[PDB]
């Protein structure tokens, strides 16, 4: 994925 | 301890002692992204702040991601 | 139009005039588990009330998982 | 021995052989619920810390819960 | 999954 | 043609070949971005609706986005 982490 | 730890979805292992949490916080993309919600195992638990949410816990994979559990 | 489809998480194809959707509602499990969210396609929007958050969009793959794009 | 063996949800598994349903929390716990896994093999599998498994020897014993 | 769908 | 291979992130890949960087949305693409796939093929790989193709032909050229 392109980010890195999780985002809500 | 088994903890969940992002990026993974799948259970880790921490050392004995350590605390699994979640930890829901605003990152350099929170007005483009919204609040990052990671997931990790740590010595203490996080900080609870006017801008930070966070699940700490003692036992195996207990840190999924948080949910609402109410309309 | 390519519309995501839940339960699962890939493009799925659906008939030309439809619109790709995400519902976010109360089900029976609400108070246990919090609100539903599904994402479908339909030939019309569905409908948006008190309880209900709806989002419609006609181009292909625009109705992923939901986000609060702000802190 | 007939067994649930996922996604199927039913097939004959030979004599010896038990069913088993397999269920577990990954990260999407509260969000899906649990991992579920429904099979059969030659012996109970071994599985670790955070895992259930329940092994019967009984046809379709092993449903979805 | 044991559910049908996904919960927030 | 040196191209970076996911999850790698360099690879020597035989003289014709191309690198590729394919992104596309999936149902998470709000929660952790686009899915991306880096590598390389004898020719410009097919894809579909929704899917985002950029093939190059120099060494290092398929970087992650």
Redesign the interface.
């Given at each position: 994925?392109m980010?890195?982490?999780?985002?809500? | 301890i088994?903890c969940?730890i992002?990026?993974?979805?799948?259970?880790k292992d921490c050392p004995n002692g350590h605390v699994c949490y979640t930890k829901?916080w605003?990152?350099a993309?929170?007005?483009?992204?919204?609040?990052?919600?990671?997931?990790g195992c740590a010595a203490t638990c996080p900080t609870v702040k006017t801008?930070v949410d966070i699940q700490c816990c003692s036992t195996?994979?207990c840190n999924?991601?948080?949910?609402?559990?109410?309309?």
């Amino acid at each position: 994925y392109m980010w890195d982490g999780w985002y809500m | 301890i088994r903890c969940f730890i992002t990026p993974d979805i799948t259970s880790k292992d921490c050392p004995n002692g350590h605390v699994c949490y979640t930890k829901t916080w605003c990152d350099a993309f929170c007005s483009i992204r919204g609040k990052r919600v990671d997931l990790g195992c740590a010595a203490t638990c996080p900080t609870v702040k006017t801008g930070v949410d966070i699940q700490c816990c003692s036992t195996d994979n207990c840190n999924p991601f948080p949910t609402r559990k109410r309309p």
